[model samples]
Target: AQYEDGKQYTTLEKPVAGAPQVLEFFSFFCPHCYQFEEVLHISDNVKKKLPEGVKMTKYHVNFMGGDLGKDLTQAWAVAMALGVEDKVTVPLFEGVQKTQTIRSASDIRDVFINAGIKGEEYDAAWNSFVVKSLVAQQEKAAADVQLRGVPAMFVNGKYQLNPQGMDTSNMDVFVQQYADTVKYLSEK
Candidate 1:
């Protein structure tokens, strides 16, 4: 398929290695990112089509939602540290974007609380070294990737997917093609 650089994808300045990784840089408050999960199910569908050993990771970007951006990133880090991402992600997203109930640290805490994560436990994870480190790492990664928008996908930390050049004639074909692009880039 003639996947051109700067069109279908852009090569990263510093390519990374370890595993064939699909790093999705997103923001909880970004409506498109929210729709990607709730409406399109991009990541979930893409994962199913990815090759064996091609791992996927979500990096919460702290560039949107005003001052709440960093807090939201920390919230995601805490969820990751507590191993409750599945339990809290959607609720958090809905709280921030759909219900518009999340605005402060306390509000964010409530999302975790409702997810069965104790308040003290959430507080501990929020302050833990591991979660803090993840937040910093994500912030650094967002800058390093020259992120200008949310819901960006990088394959193997080298190629950034450019959906503008993709044929999104249908949902199924679009996802398959997205996966194919990731698979093709992972080999490089």
Candidate 2:
């Protein structure tokens, strides 16, 4: 499943049946993604208010390159492949943004190790089919979505051009409004 140059990654098979689905496109190194964290923190309210069956799924994009992006992408691929995504995602973001740590492959390995993913396992998983598959999937998702920026969002396959568009200086409100828009779209 390791991503080859010309493979397609699996995406949301289809919109969730009878429920609204929100796909958040983000990158670890993106400053906007970091800023969006505050909004995501308050998204619990949106979730609670969402009509039954509405859900949110985060999709990490690997648009940035070089050491930081590569390392972070690899870590993401490894964690997702090993089914430890939820365990490592927030910490990885916090490590990069909050701690202002340099994001490199070695740095990611350290984070993974601290998060209880053994080095051997991490290495093996990094080289596994799952990682390859997930990496390919992420790349495919980015392309299929025609994503041009990090921290962009898609609601039920429709793009939200500018959630932060001029309404509020607070990014959190933008996110909340984006969520609200998705809810409204899903119900229609």
Candidate 3:
């Protein structure tokens, strides 16, 4: 409740029960999002601080809307569903941010392959209809949020962590702000 009249986060239209479902609505092509990822791993601080019972998921934003981003959205969601988010997340960001030729979904898989996702689970989740459905739903959810930009956070599908909506100086500041904000809001 430190936000004071919804300054930092916007409450969801339909909030989820139990612990908060924190979401990182990011983009593979966005530079600031890449910065967030870099700082997150460089210090490896987020995993320890991300509050318990809060299911935070990283969604590859399709706001850019092209073959590259489109393909990435699917690949990201698939990687997430396949339960390899931790293994591939950093590399995925680095691969796309640099000269890694991840122009398509298969190319993205190559990045994940090196991340150590080789198994029956990998192939199944990659082609699963559930993954496709999840991607489609996320597309609608992204539009539902009317996102102004990338590297955004949504708590419990109701509260949106708008950086512009906050007074934080940088993305790194938002990390702590996020923990404090959600921990307070999640008091139930």
Candidate 4:
């Protein structure tokens, strides 16, 4: 019945449909984002807590690795289109944040290639209109929201979640509180 604006979340001036949707904006080069995924497993845990029919989508931001950032975003789109995120997401995160082996777009492509996507299939998905358009849409969403940091979540492309307001003393509490905020906002 009560919430703090700007602290818990700041409502969008022009809110999109506040359906049961959660959109995450993150970058592979970001350590915090990597921890959100790998260490905390926030996305996976949040999904588990989400009610049925609540859809969550992860969008890779293009402001981290310069042109390579853009390439990584494209790589994400390719992986999603090919239904291989389970294969490539963490590897790309490790590639950038840990191993530091991914240097070029080709390097990014190689991750997919090694993930069982044939070279030709990877190339086609990387260059496909759908993938490119998805990347552009992600860039536009980031710009529209004026995203200031990684691991940001917007409920249905509207309310920008403020993690600072959540209880983060422990993993269980964090996930429970985070999913509660998301479920609350998705209906607003």
Residues 1-95, candidate 2: write the lDDT tens digits.
Answer: 32211221122334333322566667777777766664355345456656877667666776665567766776788887777866787777877
> Candidate 4 has which clashing residue pairs, if any?
none
Computed on alpha carbons, the lDDT of every model, listed in order, comes to: 0.83, 0.64, 0.68, 0.83
Q: Candidate 4: TM-score?
A: 0.90
lDDT at 178, model 2:
54
Report the lDDT tens digits of candidate 1 across residue range 37-69. Answer: 887788888788777876788889877877899
Q: Model 1 reaches what TM-score against the true structure?
A: 0.90
lDDT tens digits, residues 1-188, model 4?
35677867887787655333788989999888998888788888778767788888888987788999988888888988989989998889999989999999989988888888999998888879999888887887777777878889888767888888877778778777777777778667
Q: Candidate 3, TM-score vs. the true structure?
A: 0.75
Ranking by lDDT: 4, 1, 3, 2
Please list the residue runs of candidate 2 whose C-alpha ends up more than 4 Å from where it truly belongs after superposition: 1-20, 38-46, 169-173
Q: On a 0 to 100 scale, what is the lDDT of residue 47 in model 3? A: 42
Instruction: Note each model's CA RMSD in angstroms.
Output: 1.9, 9.0, 3.7, 2.0
* Per-model TM against the reference: 0.90, 0.74, 0.75, 0.90
- lDDT score, residue 65, model 2? 52
The regions of model 1 sitting more than 4 angstroms off are 13-20
**Which stretches in model 4 have alpha-carbon errors above 4 Å?**
17-20
Model 3 has an lDDT value of: 0.68
**Model 3 residue 54 lDDT score:** 53
